[PDB]
Amino acid sequence: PQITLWQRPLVTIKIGGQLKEALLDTGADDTVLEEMSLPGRWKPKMIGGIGGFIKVRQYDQIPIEICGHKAIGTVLVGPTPTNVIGRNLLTQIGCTLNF
Amino acid sequence: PQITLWQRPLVTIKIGGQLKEALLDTGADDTVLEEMSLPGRWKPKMIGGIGGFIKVRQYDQIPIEICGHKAIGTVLVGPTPTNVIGRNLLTQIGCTLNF
Ligand SMILES: COC(=O)N[C@H](C(=O)NN(CCC[C@@]1(O)Cc2ccc(cc2)C/C=C\CNC(=O)[C@H](C(C)C)NC1=O)Cc1ccc(-c2cccnc2)cc1)C(C)(C)C
Ligand SMILES: [Cl-]
Ligand SMILES: [Cl-]
Ligand SMILES: [Cl-]
Numbered sequence: 001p002q003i004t005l006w007q008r009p010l011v012t013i014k015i016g017g018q019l020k021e022a023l024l025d026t027g028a029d030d031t032v033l034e035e036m037s038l039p040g041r042w043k044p045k046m047i048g049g050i051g052g053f054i055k056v057r058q059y060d061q062i063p064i065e066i067c068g069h070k071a072i073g074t075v076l077v078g079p080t081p082t083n084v085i086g087r088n089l090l091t092q093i094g095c096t097l098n099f
Numbered sequence: 100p101q102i103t104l105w106q107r108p109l110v111t112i113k114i115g116g117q118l119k120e121a122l123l124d125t126g127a128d129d130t131v132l133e134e135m136s137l138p139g140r141w142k143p144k145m146i147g148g149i150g151g152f153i154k155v156r157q158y159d160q161i162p163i164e165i166c167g168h169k170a171i172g173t174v175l176v177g178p179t180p181t182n183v184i185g186r187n188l189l190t191q192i193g194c195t196l197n198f
């Protein structure tokens with residue numbers, strides 16, 4: 001698709017058997033989701049943005065579907081104010097910026 | 100151009116006759132730059148990121164070139180971790196997301 005930026009670019013994702021809404025975020029290195037369960041090993045991480053840092057759990061090799069596009073990658077889970085899809089997964093679905 | 104997302108989408112901007120580096124950030128409603136001088140009066144704004152809220156100075160109707168593309172719009176100035184170009188200006192330069 002071509003996604004306009006007049007509005008926030010929100011999409012449906014499927015992850016861990018759940019459907020969630022998330023923001024396609026070219027400014028984000030990492031994908032970060034609100035608290036949820038994921039299977040397998042994790043390790044703690046601090047990530048920073050406007051306003052400072054939060055602590056998250058880092059899960060690797062997590063399958064995700066974004067707009068019907070399957071990918072696998074690292075998902076961070078913690079007290080983010082909003083669900084963001086970062087570059088680590090945007091690359092995998094072939095997402096580009098164009099102007 | 101078409102910008103892939105394997106690296107941070109950093110571009111050169113020009114504002115107040117000076118070149119700076121900034122991040123093209125579809126997850127950002129607004130454009131926020133690190134401390135700098137701009138002309139005219141400013142208004143208060145509080146913006147929220149992953150780590151919480153910061154106070155910024157809002158300047159309106161500021162000329163800014165982004166990758167050589169001319170825009171004129173609202174620029175926020177404050178203690179951001181990096182210069183970010185948000186949707187308010189990404190729409191002026193005709194940016195979309197595509198996959
Ligand atoms: C609607 O408000 C906003 O548009 N906020 C924006 C914003 O923070 N949006 N975020 C999107 C993520 C912004 C950013 O790309 C901005 C950003 C910050 C630092 C850096 C790059 C880009 C570089 C430093 C380290 C790397 N950090 C990151 O890559 C992080 C991580 C999320 C991966 N990236 C970012 O945090 C998502 C976000 C959206 C809403 C909100 C909080 C939010 C809304 C209402 N109330 C509280 C918080 C976060 C502003 C930049 C204008 C503050
Ligand atoms: Cl990854
Ligand atoms: Cl590619
Ligand atoms: Cl504007």
